[PDB]
Write an enzyme that holds these catalytic residues in place. Structure first.
Site, PDB file in Angstrom:
ATOM      1  N   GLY A   2      -3.073 -11.822 -25.276  1.00  0.00           N
ATOM      2  CA  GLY A   2      -2.859 -12.969 -26.141  1.00  0.00           C
ATOM      3  C   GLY A   2      -1.987 -14.017 -25.482  1.00  0.00           C
ATOM      4  O   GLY A   2      -2.241 -14.419 -24.345  1.00  0.00           O
TER       5      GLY A   2
ATOM      6  N   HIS B 124      -7.730  -9.250 -17.045  1.00  0.00           N
ATOM      7  CA  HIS B 124      -8.504 -10.387 -17.534  1.00  0.00           C
ATOM      8  C   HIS B 124      -7.824 -11.708 -17.201  1.00  0.00           C
ATOM      9  O   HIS B 124      -8.489 -12.678 -16.816  1.00  0.00           O
ATOM     10  CB  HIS B 124      -8.715 -10.258 -19.042  1.00  0.00           C
ATOM     11  CG  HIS B 124      -9.499 -11.383 -19.643  1.00  0.00           C
ATOM     12  ND1 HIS B 124      -8.932 -12.326 -20.472  1.00  0.00           N
ATOM     13  CD2 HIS B 124     -10.806 -11.717 -19.532  1.00  0.00           C
ATOM     14  CE1 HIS B 124      -9.858 -13.190 -20.850  1.00  0.00           C
ATOM     15  NE2 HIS B 124     -11.004 -12.843 -20.293  1.00  0.00           N
TER      16      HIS B 124
ATOM     17  N   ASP C   2     -14.887 -12.179 -19.305  1.00  0.00           N
ATOM     18  CA  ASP C   2     -14.763 -11.907 -20.733  1.00  0.00           C
ATOM     19  C   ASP C   2     -15.452 -10.604 -21.117  1.00  0.00           C
ATOM     20  O   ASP C   2     -14.942  -9.852 -21.955  1.00  0.00           O
ATOM     21  CB  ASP C   2     -15.338 -13.072 -21.537  1.00  0.00           C
ATOM     22  CG  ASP C   2     -14.459 -14.305 -21.487  1.00  0.00           C
ATOM     23  OD1 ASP C   2     -13.337 -14.216 -20.944  1.00  0.00           O
ATOM     24  OD2 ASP C   2     -14.891 -15.364 -21.991  1.00  0.00           O
TER      25      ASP C   2
HETATM   26  C1  VRD Z   1      -7.167  -9.789 -25.771  1.00  0.00           C
HETATM   27  C2  VRD Z   1      -7.648 -11.025 -26.551  1.00  0.00           C
HETATM   28  C3  VRD Z   1      -7.087 -12.375 -26.025  1.00  0.00           C
HETATM   29  C4  VRD Z   1      -6.979 -12.770 -24.686  1.00  0.00           C
HETATM   30  C5  VRD Z   1      -7.365 -11.968 -23.431  1.00  0.00           C
HETATM   31  O1  VRD Z   1      -8.494 -11.647 -23.243  1.00  0.00           O
HETATM   32  C6  VRD Z   1      -6.266 -11.568 -22.440  1.00  0.00           C
HETATM   33  N1  VRD Z   1      -4.904 -11.411 -22.920  1.00  0.00           N
HETATM   34  O2  VRD Z   1      -6.517 -11.394 -21.300  1.00  0.00           O
HETATM   35  C7  VRD Z   1      -6.425 -14.065 -24.702  1.00  0.00           C
HETATM   36  C8  VRD Z   1      -6.075 -14.984 -23.693  1.00  0.00           C
HETATM   37  O3  VRD Z   1      -6.267 -14.646 -22.327  1.00  0.00           O
HETATM   38  C9  VRD Z   1      -6.742 -15.698 -21.520  1.00  0.00           C
HETATM   39  C10 VRD Z   1      -5.559 -16.344 -20.802  1.00  0.00           C
HETATM   40  O4  VRD Z   1      -4.396 -15.906 -20.992  1.00  0.00           O
HETATM   41  O5  VRD Z   1      -5.744 -17.315 -20.025  1.00  0.00           O
HETATM   42  C11 VRD Z   1      -5.535 -16.219 -24.038  1.00  0.00           C
HETATM   43  C12 VRD Z   1      -5.342 -16.551 -25.383  1.00  0.00           C
HETATM   44  C13 VRD Z   1      -5.689 -15.642 -26.380  1.00  0.00           C
HETATM   45  C14 VRD Z   1      -6.235 -14.392 -26.032  1.00  0.00           C
HETATM   46  N2  VRD Z   1      -6.648 -13.361 -26.797  1.00  0.00           N
HETATM   47  C15 VRD Z   1      -6.595 -13.331 -28.268  1.00  0.00           C
HETATM   48  C16 VRD Z   1      -7.905 -13.890 -28.891  1.00  0.00           C
HETATM   49  C17 VRD Z   1      -8.972 -14.240 -28.079  1.00  0.00           C
HETATM   50  C18 VRD Z   1     -10.140 -14.739 -28.648  1.00  0.00           C
HETATM   51  C19 VRD Z   1     -10.234 -14.887 -30.023  1.00  0.00           C
HETATM   52  C20 VRD Z   1      -9.166 -14.537 -30.835  1.00  0.00           C
HETATM   53  C21 VRD Z   1      -8.001 -14.038 -30.269  1.00  0.00           C
END
Ligand code: VRD
Ligand code: VRD
Ligand code: VRD
Lengths: 121, 121
Positions: free
Chosen positions: A29, A47, A89
């Site tokens: 997140g 990720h 993803d």
């Molecule tokens: C694990 C889910 C996740 C991310 C991941 O998949 C992860 N922590 O890798 C992520 C995220 O990651 C990409 C990054 O930080 O650039 C950034 C922002 C939110 C992120 N949610 C929460 C979420 C995603 C999609 C819909 C609803 C909630």
């Protein structure tokens, strides 16, 4: 984009993406990367590093095309960067489902500012 | 950045930001704007439209300076974009606190595909 990521996590894990993973551990997140707390946290760590290699496009806002065939995420995008994005993803959605067995609700709303620093991607 | 925004929300509302607002209604959290479900949802709607009016600074990553003086958020920031960014975050923190009386727990982690498309800012 984050839309397709959220749909993927819902399809693979069956869990509300922002509830279970919007602030999980040190990597899931908001607020960047940190030392992973567990296997679920490491999925998000990997990720986020997957996103940092996307040198030719933009993971948060670029929409891509994928399909749900035989209960499998299939990235049919022809654009190489969007294809690489879709595979980032898809990997984390599969990783999160594969590690639901060690999911710990104590990490669900983790105070990320006090996380140990992460290694370089 | 999200650090300042989260701290502002905690100081004004007394609630933890990711647990109570990380995914609320159609506008709070990631995944863009939508037709808001209630007044709390509309705060995040206006907040995202506020971010859209900024002049180049990154709302997610750029840090700014603010103070909690006599139970009031004060944006002492002098950079024009970061000052406006601080004012956007202060506005939503006040908005969420003003509308706690109608905070509906059922709209927490509201499924975001559910939502109708939002009007233009
Ligand atoms: C694990 C889910 C996740 C991310 C991941 O998949 C992860 N922590 O890798 C992520 C995220 O990651 C990409 C990054 O930080 O650039 C950034 C922002 C939110 C992120 N949610 C929460 C979420 C995603 C999609 C819909 C609803 C909630
Ligand atoms: C960094 C943003 C944030 C939280 C996050 O975004 C985070 N660590 O996930 C969070 C928080 O956690 C979310 C939740 O429990 O709902 C709980 C309480 C405050 C929280 N601040 C503001 C803050 C944190 C640490 C020191 C000073 C200000
Ligand atoms: C209402 C809380 C909120 C956002 C809002 O204030 C809102 N939806 O307006 C927001 C957000 O919005 C800005 C944008 O979309 O660029 C993006 C990502 C997460 C967002 N959290 C959750 C959160 C913020 C800070 C610390 C801990 C949790």
């Amino acid at each position: 984009s984050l839309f397709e990521l959220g749909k993927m996590i819902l399809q693979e894990t069956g869990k509300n993406p922002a509830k279970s993973y919007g602030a999980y551990g040190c990597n899931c997140g908001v607020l960047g990367r940190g030392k992973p707390k567990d296997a679920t946290d490491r999925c998000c760590y990997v990720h986020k590093c997957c996103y940092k290699k996307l040198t030719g496009c933009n993971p948060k806002k670029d929409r891509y095309s994928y399909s749900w065939k035989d209960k499998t995420i299939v990235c049919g995008e022809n654009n190489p960067c969007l294809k690489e994005l879709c595979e980032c993803d898809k990997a984390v959605a599969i990783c999160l489902r594969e590690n639901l067995g060690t999911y710990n609700k104590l990490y669900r709303y983790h105070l990320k500012p006090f996380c140990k620093k992460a290694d370089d991607c």
